[PDB]
Tab-separated table of C-alpha atoms in Angstrom:
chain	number	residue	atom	x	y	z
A	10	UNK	CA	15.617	-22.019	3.396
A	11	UNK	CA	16.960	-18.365	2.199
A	12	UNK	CA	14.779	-16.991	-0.777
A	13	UNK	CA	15.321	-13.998	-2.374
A	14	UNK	CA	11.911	-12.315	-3.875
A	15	UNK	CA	11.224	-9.021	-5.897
A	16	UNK	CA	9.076	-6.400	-4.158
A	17	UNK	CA	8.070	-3.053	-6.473
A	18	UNK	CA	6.808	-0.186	-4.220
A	19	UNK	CA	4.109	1.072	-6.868
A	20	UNK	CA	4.041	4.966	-7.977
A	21	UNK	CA	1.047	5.273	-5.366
A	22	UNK	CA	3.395	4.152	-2.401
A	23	UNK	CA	6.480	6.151	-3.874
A	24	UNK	CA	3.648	9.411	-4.166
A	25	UNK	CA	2.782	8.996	-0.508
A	26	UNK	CA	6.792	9.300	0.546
A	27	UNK	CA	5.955	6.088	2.819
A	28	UNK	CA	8.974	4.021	1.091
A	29	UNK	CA	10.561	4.101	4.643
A	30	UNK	CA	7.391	3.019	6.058
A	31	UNK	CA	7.452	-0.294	3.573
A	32	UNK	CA	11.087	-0.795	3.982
A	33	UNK	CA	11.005	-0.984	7.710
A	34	UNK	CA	7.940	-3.495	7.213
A	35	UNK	CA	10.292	-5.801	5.304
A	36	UNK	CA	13.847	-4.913	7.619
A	37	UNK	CA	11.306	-5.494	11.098
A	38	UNK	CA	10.511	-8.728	9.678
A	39	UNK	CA	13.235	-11.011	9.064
A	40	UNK	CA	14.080	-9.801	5.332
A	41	UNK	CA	17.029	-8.346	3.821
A	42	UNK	CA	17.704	-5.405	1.322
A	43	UNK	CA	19.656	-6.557	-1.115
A	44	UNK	CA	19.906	-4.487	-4.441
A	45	UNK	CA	17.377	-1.887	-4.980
A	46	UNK	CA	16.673	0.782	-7.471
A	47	UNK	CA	14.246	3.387	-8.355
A	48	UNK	CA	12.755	3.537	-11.581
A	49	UNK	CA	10.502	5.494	-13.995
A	50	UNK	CA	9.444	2.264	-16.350
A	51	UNK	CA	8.300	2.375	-19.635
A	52	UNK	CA	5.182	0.919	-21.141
A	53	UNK	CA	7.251	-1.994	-22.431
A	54	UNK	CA	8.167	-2.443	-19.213
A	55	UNK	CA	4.959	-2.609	-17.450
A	56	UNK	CA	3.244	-4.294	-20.327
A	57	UNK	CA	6.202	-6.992	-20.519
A	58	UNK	CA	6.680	-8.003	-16.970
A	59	UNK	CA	2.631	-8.098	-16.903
A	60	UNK	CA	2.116	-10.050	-19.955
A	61	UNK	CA	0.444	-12.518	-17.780
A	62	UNK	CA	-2.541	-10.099	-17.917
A	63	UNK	CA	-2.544	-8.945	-21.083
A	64	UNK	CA	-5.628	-10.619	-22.053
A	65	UNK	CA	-7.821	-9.105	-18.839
A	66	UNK	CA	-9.978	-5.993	-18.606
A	67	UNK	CA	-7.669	-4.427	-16.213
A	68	UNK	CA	-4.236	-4.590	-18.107
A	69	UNK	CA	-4.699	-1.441	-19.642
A	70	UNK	CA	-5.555	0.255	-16.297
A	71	UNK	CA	-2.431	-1.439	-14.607
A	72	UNK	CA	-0.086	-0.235	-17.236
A	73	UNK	CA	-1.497	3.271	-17.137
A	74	UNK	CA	-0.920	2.758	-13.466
A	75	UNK	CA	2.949	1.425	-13.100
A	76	UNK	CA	4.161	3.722	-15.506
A	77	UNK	CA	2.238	7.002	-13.876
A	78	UNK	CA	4.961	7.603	-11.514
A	79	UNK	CA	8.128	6.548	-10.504
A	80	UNK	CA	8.755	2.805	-8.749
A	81	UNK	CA	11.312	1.426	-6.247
A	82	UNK	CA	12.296	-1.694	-6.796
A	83	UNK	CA	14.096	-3.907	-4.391
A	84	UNK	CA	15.316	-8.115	-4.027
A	85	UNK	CA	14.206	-9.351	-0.636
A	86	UNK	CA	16.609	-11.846	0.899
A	87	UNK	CA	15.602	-14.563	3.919
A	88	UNK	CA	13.810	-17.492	4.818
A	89	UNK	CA	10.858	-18.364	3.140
A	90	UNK	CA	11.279	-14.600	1.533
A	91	UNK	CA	8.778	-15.551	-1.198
A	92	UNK	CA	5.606	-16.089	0.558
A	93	UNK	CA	6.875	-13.897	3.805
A	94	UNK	CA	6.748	-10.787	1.385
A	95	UNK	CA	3.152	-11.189	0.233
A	96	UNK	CA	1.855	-12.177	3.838
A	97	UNK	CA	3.498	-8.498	4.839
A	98	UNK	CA	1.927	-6.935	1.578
A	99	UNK	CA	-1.595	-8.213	2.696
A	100	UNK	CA	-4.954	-9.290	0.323
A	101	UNK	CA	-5.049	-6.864	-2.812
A	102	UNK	CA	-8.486	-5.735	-1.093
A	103	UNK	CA	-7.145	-3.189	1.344
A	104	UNK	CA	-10.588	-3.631	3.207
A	105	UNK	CA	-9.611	-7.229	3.475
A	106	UNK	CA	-5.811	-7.080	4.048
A	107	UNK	CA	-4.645	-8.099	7.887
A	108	UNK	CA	-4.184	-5.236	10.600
A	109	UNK	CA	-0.636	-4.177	9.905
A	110	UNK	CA	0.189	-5.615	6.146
A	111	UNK	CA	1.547	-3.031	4.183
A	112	UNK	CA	-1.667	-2.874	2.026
A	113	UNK	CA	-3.693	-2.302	5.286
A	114	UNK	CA	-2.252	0.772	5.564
A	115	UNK	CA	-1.031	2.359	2.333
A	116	UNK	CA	-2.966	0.853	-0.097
A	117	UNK	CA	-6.106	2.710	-2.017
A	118	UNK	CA	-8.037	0.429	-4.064
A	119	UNK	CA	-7.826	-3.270	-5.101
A	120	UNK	CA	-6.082	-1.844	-8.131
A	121	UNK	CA	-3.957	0.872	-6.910
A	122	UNK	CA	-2.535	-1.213	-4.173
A	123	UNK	CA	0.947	-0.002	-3.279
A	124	UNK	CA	2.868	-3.260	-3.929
A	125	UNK	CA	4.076	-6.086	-6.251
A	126	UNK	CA	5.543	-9.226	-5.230
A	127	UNK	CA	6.509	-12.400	-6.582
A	128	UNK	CA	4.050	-15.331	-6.535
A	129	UNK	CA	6.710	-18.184	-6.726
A	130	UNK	CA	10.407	-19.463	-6.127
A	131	UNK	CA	9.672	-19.373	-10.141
A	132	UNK	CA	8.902	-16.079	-10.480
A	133	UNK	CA	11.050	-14.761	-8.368
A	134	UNK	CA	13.555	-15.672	-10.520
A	135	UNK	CA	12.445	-14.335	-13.272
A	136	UNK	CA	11.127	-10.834	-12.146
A	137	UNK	CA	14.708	-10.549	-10.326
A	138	UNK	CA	16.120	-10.935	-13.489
A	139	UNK	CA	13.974	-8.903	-15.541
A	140	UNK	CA	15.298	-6.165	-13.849
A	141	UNK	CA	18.536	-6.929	-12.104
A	142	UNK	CA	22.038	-8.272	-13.649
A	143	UNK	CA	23.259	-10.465	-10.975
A	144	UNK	CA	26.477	-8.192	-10.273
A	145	UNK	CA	23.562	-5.628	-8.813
A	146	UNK	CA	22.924	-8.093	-5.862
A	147	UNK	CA	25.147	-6.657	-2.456
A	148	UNK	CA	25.770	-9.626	-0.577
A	149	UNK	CA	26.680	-8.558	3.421
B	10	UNK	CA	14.649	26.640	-3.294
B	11	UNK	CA	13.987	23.358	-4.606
B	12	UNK	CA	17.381	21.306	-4.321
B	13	UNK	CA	18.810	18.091	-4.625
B	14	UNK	CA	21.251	16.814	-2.193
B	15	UNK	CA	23.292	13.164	-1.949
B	16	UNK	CA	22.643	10.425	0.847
B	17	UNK	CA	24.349	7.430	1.584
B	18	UNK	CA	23.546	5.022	4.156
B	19	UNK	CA	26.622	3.380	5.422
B	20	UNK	CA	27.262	-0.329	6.038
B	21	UNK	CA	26.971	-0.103	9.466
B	22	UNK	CA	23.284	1.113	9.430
B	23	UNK	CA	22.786	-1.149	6.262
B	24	UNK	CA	24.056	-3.649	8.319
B	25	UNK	CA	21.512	-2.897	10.603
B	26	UNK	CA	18.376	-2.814	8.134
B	27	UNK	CA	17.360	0.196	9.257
B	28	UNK	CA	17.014	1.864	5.471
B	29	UNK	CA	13.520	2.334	6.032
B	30	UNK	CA	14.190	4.156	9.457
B	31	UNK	CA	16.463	6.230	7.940
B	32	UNK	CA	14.447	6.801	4.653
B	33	UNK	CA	11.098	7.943	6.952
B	34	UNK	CA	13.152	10.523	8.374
B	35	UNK	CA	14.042	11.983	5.470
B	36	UNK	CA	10.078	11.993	4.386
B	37	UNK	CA	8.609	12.478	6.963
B	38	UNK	CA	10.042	15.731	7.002
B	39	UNK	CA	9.293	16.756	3.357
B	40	UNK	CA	12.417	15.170	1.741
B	41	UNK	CA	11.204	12.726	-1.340
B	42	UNK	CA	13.622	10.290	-2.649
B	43	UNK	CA	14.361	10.569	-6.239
B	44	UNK	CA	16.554	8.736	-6.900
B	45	UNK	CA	18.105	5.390	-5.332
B	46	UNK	CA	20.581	2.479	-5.565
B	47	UNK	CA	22.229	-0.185	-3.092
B	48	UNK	CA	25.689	-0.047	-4.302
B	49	UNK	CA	29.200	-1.764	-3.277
B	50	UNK	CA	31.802	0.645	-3.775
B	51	UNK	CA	34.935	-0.143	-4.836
B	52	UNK	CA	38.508	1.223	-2.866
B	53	UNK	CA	39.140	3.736	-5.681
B	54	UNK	CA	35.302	4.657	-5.811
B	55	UNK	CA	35.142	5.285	-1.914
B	56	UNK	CA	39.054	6.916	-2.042
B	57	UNK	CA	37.445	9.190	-4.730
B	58	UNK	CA	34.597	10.252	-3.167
B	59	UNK	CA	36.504	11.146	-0.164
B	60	UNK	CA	39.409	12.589	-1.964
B	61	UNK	CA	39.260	15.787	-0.261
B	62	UNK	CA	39.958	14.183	2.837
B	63	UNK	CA	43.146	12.174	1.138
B	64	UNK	CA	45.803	14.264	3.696
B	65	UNK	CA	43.394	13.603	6.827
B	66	UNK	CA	44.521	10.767	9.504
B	67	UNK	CA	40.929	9.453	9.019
B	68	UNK	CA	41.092	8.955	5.802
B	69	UNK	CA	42.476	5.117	5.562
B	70	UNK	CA	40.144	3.973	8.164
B	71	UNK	CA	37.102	5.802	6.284
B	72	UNK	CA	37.551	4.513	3.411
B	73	UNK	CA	38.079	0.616	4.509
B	74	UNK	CA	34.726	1.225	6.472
B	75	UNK	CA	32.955	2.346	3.365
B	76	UNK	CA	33.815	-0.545	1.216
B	77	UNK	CA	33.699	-2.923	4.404
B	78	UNK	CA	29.852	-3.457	3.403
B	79	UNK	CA	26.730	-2.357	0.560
B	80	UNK	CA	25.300	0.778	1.426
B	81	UNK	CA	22.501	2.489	0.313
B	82	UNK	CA	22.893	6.167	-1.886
B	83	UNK	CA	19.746	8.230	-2.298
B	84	UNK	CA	19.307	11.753	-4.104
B	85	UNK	CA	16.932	13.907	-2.090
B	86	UNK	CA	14.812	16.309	-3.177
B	87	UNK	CA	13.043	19.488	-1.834
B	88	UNK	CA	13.368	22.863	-0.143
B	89	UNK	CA	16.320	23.477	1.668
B	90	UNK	CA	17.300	19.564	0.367
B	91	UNK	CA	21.179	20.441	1.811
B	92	UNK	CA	20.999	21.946	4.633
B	93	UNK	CA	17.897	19.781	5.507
B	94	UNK	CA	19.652	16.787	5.343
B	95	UNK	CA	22.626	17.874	7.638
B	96	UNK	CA	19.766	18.674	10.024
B	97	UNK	CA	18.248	15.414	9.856
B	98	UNK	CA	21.494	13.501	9.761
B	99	UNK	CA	22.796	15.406	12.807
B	100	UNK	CA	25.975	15.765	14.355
B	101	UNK	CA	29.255	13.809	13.422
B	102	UNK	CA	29.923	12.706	16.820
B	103	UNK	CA	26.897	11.043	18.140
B	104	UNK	CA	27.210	12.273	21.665
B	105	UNK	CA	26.792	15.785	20.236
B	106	UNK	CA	23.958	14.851	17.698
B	107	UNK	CA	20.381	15.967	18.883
B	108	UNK	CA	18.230	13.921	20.056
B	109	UNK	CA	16.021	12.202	17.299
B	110	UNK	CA	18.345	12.861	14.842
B	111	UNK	CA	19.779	9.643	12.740
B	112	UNK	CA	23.470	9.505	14.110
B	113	UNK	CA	21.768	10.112	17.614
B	114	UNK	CA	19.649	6.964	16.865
B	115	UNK	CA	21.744	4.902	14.379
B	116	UNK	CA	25.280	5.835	14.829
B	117	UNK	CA	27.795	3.984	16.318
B	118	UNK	CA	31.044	6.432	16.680
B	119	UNK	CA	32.022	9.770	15.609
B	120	UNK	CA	33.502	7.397	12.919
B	121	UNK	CA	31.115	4.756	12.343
B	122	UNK	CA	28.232	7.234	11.674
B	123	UNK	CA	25.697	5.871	9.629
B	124	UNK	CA	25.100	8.451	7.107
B	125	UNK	CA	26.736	11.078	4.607
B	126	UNK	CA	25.276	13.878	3.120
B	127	UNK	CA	26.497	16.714	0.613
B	128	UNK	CA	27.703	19.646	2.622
B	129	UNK	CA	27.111	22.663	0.057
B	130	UNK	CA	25.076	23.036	-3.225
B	131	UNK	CA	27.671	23.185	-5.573
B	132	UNK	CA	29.183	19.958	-3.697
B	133	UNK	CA	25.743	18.210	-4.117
B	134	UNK	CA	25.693	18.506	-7.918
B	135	UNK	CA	29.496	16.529	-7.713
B	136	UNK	CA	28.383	14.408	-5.476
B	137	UNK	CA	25.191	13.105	-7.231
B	138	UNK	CA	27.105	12.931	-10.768
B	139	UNK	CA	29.643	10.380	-9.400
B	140	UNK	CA	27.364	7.889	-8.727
B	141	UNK	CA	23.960	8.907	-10.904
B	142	UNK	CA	23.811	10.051	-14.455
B	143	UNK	CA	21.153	12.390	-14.603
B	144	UNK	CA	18.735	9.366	-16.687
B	145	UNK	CA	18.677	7.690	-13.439
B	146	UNK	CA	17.260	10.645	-11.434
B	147	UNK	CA	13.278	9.987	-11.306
B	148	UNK	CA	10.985	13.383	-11.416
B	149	UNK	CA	7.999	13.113	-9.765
């Protein structure tokens, strides 16, 4: 079935100029571009669409972090899209990621890690949404 | 000098998810993208940004081929941003283009040519103000 998923390229990955790089990692592998956006959020942004955290050591760190720099953000589109974007992103370890996940190769530290991407068909929908209006989706 | 210059990815190479091919040329070669949307553009939004070809016999065709599909509109940043570009993007006609460049590698007529780019400085600064207000431009 087709998915649609969020991906953020964090302001490490945007630093390093390798958006291209990620890009082609999704376009080579079966997934879609199909709204995108780059973005300088705010610390209500990073602190709301990480509440999940908000209670851990490393919140702080990860806000300081997403709103360092600017981010691109971009909806994935294809089958199984959800899970198919964080196989290609790789284990938040870049010692552990796979040979050739996106995290393998661009990622610094378990922390500054280059990517975000949605955990669930759930929250998919919601990150989407969080920063998308639906009439900023480009069907082909 | 440190310009900014317009790109757009056209729905044929959009078509083609090749965005991230097209986006490594531009930084792998010291271009850094700041800022970015995938966009559908409307008849009078492609007629306008083409207006000063209104009075050319292309003009029809271009503009049905621009709103035929999303494409992808990036403002580029760095030395020589302009003229950089025009290099990158190469010739209109991709029998002429040099080799490597993205119509040599991505386009499909002298027509169907994958990308635009601002031709002159003061053009850029239009250019980028139809489709960005400056809020949406991300320093790094």
């Amino acid at each position: 079935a087709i998915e649609r998923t969020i991906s953020i390229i964090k302001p490490d990955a945007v630093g390093k100029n390798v958006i291209g790089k990620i890009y082609s990692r999704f376009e080579e592998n079966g997934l879609k571009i199909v709204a995108a956006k780059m973005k300088q959020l705010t610390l209500k942004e990073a602190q709301e669409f990480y509440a999940v955290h908000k209670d851990r050591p490393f919140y702080a760190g990860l806000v300081e972090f997403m709103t360092g720099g600017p981010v691109m953000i971009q909806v994935l589109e294809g089958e199984n899209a959800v899970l198919k974007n964080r196989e290609l992103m790789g284990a938040t370890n870049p010692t552990e990621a796979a040979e050739g996940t996106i995290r393998a190769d661009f990622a610094t530290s378990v922390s500054i890690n280059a990517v975000h991407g949605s955990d669930s068909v759930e929250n998919a929908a919601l990150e989407i949404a969080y920063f998308f209006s639906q009439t900023e989706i480009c069907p082909r």
